[PDB]
């Protein structure tokens, strides 16, 4: 089955209200940039971002010119002529609107609070979808907390019920309306709802992991923002998931959540796979089409793992644009983020940047020795490894933020489609490296094992293995006279 290729298409209210396809200074990446060729390479385009208003309904930003908005959306849906499988989804949320201290955070918390709020909100999502011509709903709340999770789950289930009905009513069996959410790609934010993962994903077609920004200006030392695997020389982190409300024993928590660990894409995928009831096919691996820049770094190792002087605050509290050669940075007033397009041009010029490669993380990085700069990003080469990983792990596909950051030739997007679909591309011999793999083992990813059937009335010594009710269990200590599942002395270690 075809891997999903989900591209976010983010467009600010100011750019919609002044939309044009002839002046990159106002609209840097208009829909016209998405040619029939590229439209064919994508499976989904996530139009971003919409919000939830104080009336607890889905809605466009208040400053949005609805007429312009409809026209932009129409240009996107127009792309479906070139790709019968293409879906134009819309995303609700994002950082600015939904983070704990974001402008509409309350609306999110409130909208999922009651059976009645959830119904009104669910109805509004479907209504927005049909009124503007979208093909599904994406929810990007960053991120619901433990006490809001049950409500969040109930709202998703409600939306699923409505979309399914709408699909039948519209005869959309060939391209059913979908529901997805952007999920945290790092243990810290993931810890907020991790315990109810199975329930969160049940009503979804896909959970799109934000497996990037795993390094930022808020971090102590510069690091790769989306390393596939771990680099023993890079920083390690506290495994926040051992603190999720899972209800597991110390033994269980410990084997699933090594701490500290390397904050990697592999870690995030495996952490999701460890949960029972989370199918790999619904997991989509996100990749970034932008890089994160650090200044004041110490040379010595390409600039990796060094202290820096990058303002981690948001917005960027300065007019100092230190990312040399990045006009985009001055334009958007922030030298900490740069699109792959800009970065490519930065390498194209002299600017004194050197592109290095980390064979453990399987990702590239830029280093500017003269100004002590470090840029972590991804490219067509790092994508080969991520694509192979997605196939090996039988994930649902890839997602990326965001389309408007690819180069004019659409090389990053073309690479992703090529690695999954080209008849003449073969990665069977691609060397995945020796980077550190996440070693955690949980209920959802237990090894297949065999063992004698547990026998009631038998006394087991420490370390004994038995099969009972589908799994293979091991005794944690000796003189065990009770059954697996009834005596806390048994540890589930294998399946089948």
């Amino acid at each position: 089955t075809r891997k999903a290729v989900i591209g976010y298409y983010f467009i600010p209210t100011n750019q919609i209200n002044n939309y044009t396809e002839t002046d990159t200074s106002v609209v840097p990446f208009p829909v016209s940039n998405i040619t029939p060729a590229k439209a064919k390479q994508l499976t989904h385009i996530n139009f971003s971002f919409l919000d939830i208003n104080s009336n607890l309904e889905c809605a466009w930003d208040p400053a949005t010119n609805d007429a312009k908005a409809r026209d932009v959306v129409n240009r996107l849906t127009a792309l479906k002529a070139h790709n019968p499988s293409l879906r134009i989804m819309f995303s609700i949320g994002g950082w600015y609107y939904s983070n704990d201290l974001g402008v509409s955070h309350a609306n999110y918390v409130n909208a999922v609070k009651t059976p009645a709020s959830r119904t009104k909100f669910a109805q509004s999502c479907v209504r927005i979808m049909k009124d503007y011509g979208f093909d599904g709903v994406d929810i990007d709340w960053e991120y619901p907390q433990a006490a809001e999770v049950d409500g969040f789950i109930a709202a998703l289930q409600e939306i699923r019920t409505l979309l399914n009905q709408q699909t039948i009513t519209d005869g959309r069996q060939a391209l059913p309306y979908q529901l997805t959410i952007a999920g945290a790609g790092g243990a810290f934010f993931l810890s907020r709802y991790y315990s109810k993962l199975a329930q969160i994903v049940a009503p979804l077609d896909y959970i799109n992991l934000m497996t990037y920004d795993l390094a930022g200006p808020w971090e102590k030392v510069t690091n790769h923002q989306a390393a596939l695997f771990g680099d023993a020389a890079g920083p390690t982190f506290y495994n926040a998931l051992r603190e999720a409300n899972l209800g597991w024993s110390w033994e269980e928590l410990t084997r699933a959540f090594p701490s500290p660990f390397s904050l990697t894409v592999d870690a995030a995928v495996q952490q999701h796979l460890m949960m029972e009831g989370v199918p790999s096919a619904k997991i989509v691996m996100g990749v970034p089409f932008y890089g994160r820049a650090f200044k004041g770094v110490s040379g010595g190792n390409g600039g990796q793992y060094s202290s820096h002087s990058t303002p981690g605050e948001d917005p960027y509290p300065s007019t100092d644009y230190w990312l040399v050669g990045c006009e985009e940075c001055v334009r958007d007033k922030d030298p900490r983020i740069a699109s792959y397009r800009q970065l490519e041009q930065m390498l194209q010029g002299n600017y004194g940047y050197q592109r290095l490669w980390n064979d453990k993380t399987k990702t590239p990085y830029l280093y500017h020795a003269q100004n002590g700069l470090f840029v972590t990003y991804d490219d067509a080469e790092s994508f080969k490894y991520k694509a192979k990983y997605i196939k090996q792990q039988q994930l649902g596909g890839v997602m990326f933020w965001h389309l408007g950051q690819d180069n004019r030739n659409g090389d990053l997007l073309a690479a992703l489609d090529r690695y999954f679909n080209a008849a003449d591309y073969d990665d069977s011999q691609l060397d995945m490296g020796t980077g550190l793999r996440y070693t955690g083992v949980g209920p959802g990813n237990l090894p297949i094992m065999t063992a004698p059937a547990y026998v009631p009335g038998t006394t087991y010594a420490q370390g004994a293995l038995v099969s009972y009710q589908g799994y293979v269990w091991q005794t944690k200590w000796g003189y065990i006279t009770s059954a697996p599942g009834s005596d806390s002395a048994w540890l589930k270690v294998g399946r089948v």
Partner: peptide, 5 residues
């Protein structure tokens, strides 16, 4: 923060 976050 800065992008998707």
């Amino acid at each position: 923060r800065x992008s998707h976050x």
